[PDB]
From a paper:
The histone [name]-specific methyltransferase [name] plays a critical role in development and is frequently dysregulated in human diseases, particularly cancer. [name] itself functions as a specific methyltransferase: it methylates lysine 36 of histone H3 producing mono- and di-methylated epigenetic marks H3K36me1/214,15. There is no information available about the N-terminal 2,000 amino acids of [name], though several domains have been identified in the C-terminal part, which contains the catalytic SET (Su(var), E(z), Trithorax) domain, followed by a bromodomain (BD), a plant homeodomain ([name]) finger and a bromo-adjacent homology ([name]) domain. We find that ASH1LPHD recognizes H3K4me2/3, whereas the neighboring ASH1LBD and ASH1LBAH have DNA binding activities.
To elucidate the interplay, we determined a 2.4 Å crystal structure of ASH1LPHD-[name]. Although ASH1LPHD-[name] was crystallized in the presence of H3K4me3 peptide, we did not observe electron density for the peptide. The structure of ASH1LPHD-[name] shows the formation of an integrated module with the extensive interface between ASH1LPHD and ASH1LBAH. The considerable size of this interface suggests that ASH1LPHD supports the [name] fold and may explain as to why we were unable to produce an isolated folded ASH1LBAH. A large network of inter-domain hydrogen bonding, hydrophobic, and electrostatic contacts stabilize the ASH1LPHD-[name] structure. The side chain amino group of K2807 is hydrogen bonded to the side chain carboxyl group of D2595, whereas the side chain hydroxyl moiety of Y2809 makes a hydrogen bond with the backbone amino group of I2586.Overlay of the crystal structures of ASH1LPHD-[name] and H3K4me3-bound ASH1LPHD showed that the ASH1LPHD fold superimposes very well and the H3K4me3 binding site of ASH1LPHD is not occluded by ASH1LBAH. The electrostatic surface potential of the ASH1LPHD-[name] structure showed a large positively charged surface of ASH1LBAH positioned next to the negatively charged H3K4me3-binding site of ASH1PHD and thus suggested that ASH1LBAH might bind DNA. Binding to unmodified 147 bp NCP was decreased, pointing to the contribution of the interaction of ASH1LPHD in ASH1LPHD-[name] with H3K4me3, whereas binding to unmodified 187 bp NCP was increased compared to its binding to unmodified 147 bp NCP, indicating that ASH1LBAH in ASH1LPHD-[name] prefers extra-nucleosomal linker DNA, and this preference was retained in ASH1LBD-[name]-[name].
Residue numbers in the entry:
A (entry chain A): 2583 to 2830
B (entry chain B): 2582 to 2823
The structure:
């Protein structure tokens, strides 16, 4: 089936890869510490061995500052985060309106209401000169955060891409979520994602957040193969019956 | 260097303009692959299959070249690529035609191959004539029994002697390649792919008479000892002359 089960948890078939001699899963040569010239190989499940779950960008980027190392995936304690992952973020706690957004540790959160957390797309991960983990990416706006006509209706799980970028400490990540296009949302669900953490986004906003532009190319496409994606028996037909203005 | 050189010529010279394959990381002569030295995206013939010509001409055509002759770095003898510097087995079976002129026959005629019943020859030049007939130029190696030596003189079992006896040969007269090394190299290791039976030692040259023996100081064709090209013996060999 050409199954990819790497430690990084990404399905990209870009670059050198290596197959296991027992379970037949493909893994990135860069993520594991192995050449493509090796004639025999076993994965970390078939051949249990220490694995560093934090994988550096092996083509080290040019924009990399000395002392800092860019990563394709990092660990937030026990939770693995990857480039292209959507996450829930702790709120901005600043009482100074001019100050930088201060987002506290996830460990301080009392009870998890995901609707009260900011949703964010990780574009970059890196360890700094002090080995502190950071992420860079853009925000997704919830429907109530947008300027719209009272007539406008949304999906209850609809979000909107916004050209608002931020550097965050990795501790500010509460958990992962899944942001799909409508078509993909209707077809199936990526393996190991909760129904309650699946959102729809087809539109981006301008800076005023009054203008709604259709997204043409999804920047981070999901693997649709059966080992990675659970196809629904029938395509969903969700309803745009949610209004931020008119809520109980 | 950690430079792996794998070109269609099969030579290991880091000399000349080189280009690296962005997939396998091997280096190839720009001059053999028909590419400029500064091509942003390069892939070799194995990573990006395409028609190649293994018969690579000498881009600086040599002065004093024979008229109507195109010179080459490497030429194909059927399926065997032969290169400048190669040591080869040569057919002894020959034919006369107009005058005395004996000419060595094709290797296709040979049924059973005996190494000792062939001549060892070093190829220096390779060319195609006007009719695209392939030829090689170079000098012979002499076996010990072919040398006029003092009765007391001892030899290695595979010892050969360089002689200034040059000949134009039709490429068809080549039976196969062998490997001629100095003692030091012979003792250190083997080039990849070579049979021991095709490995010989030469440290001395003779005169046209083959009575006088002179030690060679400068190897005309030094062999690449890089691990990708050369397997090193874990311990130096200890051959004894008798
Ligand atoms: Sr290049
Ligand atoms: Zn990987
Ligand atoms: Zn396995
Ligand atoms: Zn070449
Ligand atoms: Zn290549």
């Amino acid at each position: 089936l050409d199954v990819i089960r790497c430690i990084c948890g990404l399905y990209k078939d870009e670059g050198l890869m290596i197959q296991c001699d027992k379970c037949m899963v493909w893994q990135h040569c860069d993520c594991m510490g192995v050449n493509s010239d090796v004639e025999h190989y076993l994965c970390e499940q078939c051949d249990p061995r220490p694995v560093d779950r934090e994988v550096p960008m092996i083509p080290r980027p040019h924009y990399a500052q000395p002392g800092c190392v860019y990563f394709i995936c990092l660990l937030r304690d026990d939770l693995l985060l990857r480039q292209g992952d959507c996450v829930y973020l702790m709120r901005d706690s600043r009482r100074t309106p001019d100050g930088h957004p201060v987002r506290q540790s996830y460990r301080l959160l009392s009870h998890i209401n995901r609707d009260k957390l900011d949703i964010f797309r990780i574009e970059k991960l890196w360890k700094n000169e002090k080995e502190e983990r950071f992420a860079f990416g853009h925000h997704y706006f919830r429907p109530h955060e947008t300027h719209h006509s009272p007539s406008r209706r949304f999906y209850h799980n609809e979000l909107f891409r916004v050209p608002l970028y931020e550097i965050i400490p990795l501790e500010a990540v509460v958990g992962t979520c899944c942001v799909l296009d409508l078509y993909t949302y209707c077809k199936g669900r990526p393996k190991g994602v909760k129904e309650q953490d699946v959102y729809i986004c087809d539109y981006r906003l301008d800076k005023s957040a009054h203008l709604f532009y259709k997204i043409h190319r999804n920047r981070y496409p999901v693997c649709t193969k059966p080992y990675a994606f659970d196809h629904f028996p029938k395509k969903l037909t969700p309803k745009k019956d949610f209004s931020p203005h008119y809520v109980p």
